[PDB]
Amino acid sequence: SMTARPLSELVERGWAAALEPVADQVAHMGQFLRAEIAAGRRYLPAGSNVLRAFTFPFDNVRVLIVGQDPYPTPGHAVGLSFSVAPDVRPWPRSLANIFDEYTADLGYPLPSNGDLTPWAQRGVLLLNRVLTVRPSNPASHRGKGWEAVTECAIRALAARAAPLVAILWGRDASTLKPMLAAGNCVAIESPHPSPLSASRGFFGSRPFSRANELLVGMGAEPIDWRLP
Numbered sequence: 001s002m003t004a005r006p007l008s009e010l011v012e013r014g015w016a017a018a019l020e021p022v023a024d025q026v027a028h029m030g031q032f033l034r035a036e037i038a039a040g041r042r043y044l045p046a047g048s049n050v051l052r053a054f055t056f057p058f059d060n061v062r063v064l065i066v067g068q069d070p071y072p073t074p075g076h077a078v079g080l081s082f083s084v085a086p087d088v089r090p091w092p093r094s095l096a097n098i099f100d101e102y103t104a105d106l107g108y109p110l111p112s113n114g115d116l117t118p119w120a121q122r123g124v125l126l127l128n129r130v131l132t133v134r135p136s137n138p139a140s141h142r143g144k145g146w147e148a149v150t151e152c153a154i155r156a157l158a159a160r161a162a163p164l165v166a167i168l169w170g171r172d173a174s175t176l177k178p179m180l181a182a183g184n185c186v187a188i189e190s191p192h193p194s195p196l197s198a199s200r201g202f203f204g205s206r207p208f209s210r211a212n213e214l215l216v217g218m219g220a221e222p223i224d225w226r227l228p
């Protein structure tokens, strides 16, 4: 796990270099998670999926989606924010809300399933501000040291000689707003797609079409958002 091995082995080459300043903090998080198991508390997602968002190429990222923390229901979280395994049904409520906005915004049919890896394969970073959670306890790992790691990840993206659009979903995601001051970066901010906050302005936010207009405006290729 991230206790055992260096970034060079755990994440993609560009990410390994981008996250060098938090190499120790990443090892520290591995120890936090080992202490959780030792005490008999569980975490999500599975250890090998915690850093999965950093296994897609750093240099290929054009859009950053940031949520709060992983799905608290066992069998949901896969290390990509809001993504579920292609065989998961029903979809978690957040994802149902995201796909309703996806159809409203882009005019596409409902996706066949909740598997977002096409977005990750097409330059969308599916990040959470905090990369682990205790089952059934949303925000249970807030302030345990992931924030430094996702802050570093964002600074590094914003320092690239490349265009970037950030979609920040909810209050924890929005605390990355200051580290997105770079001129080649633009932030879309909305309430979380979670049922508690969705009606406060998630619905009708049109994040997907706006992201693409912003990319086009910076001479970047738009994202192909269409899922099968």
Ligand SMILES: O=C(O)c1[nH]c(=O)[nH]c(=O)c1F
Pocket: 066, 067, 068, 069, 070, 071, 072, 077, 080, 081, 082, 083, 092, 094, 095, 128, 169, 170, 192, 194
């Ligand atoms: O629990 C959720 O709905 C949820 N919320 C988030 O902010 N990110 C996720 O990756 C996620 F699965």
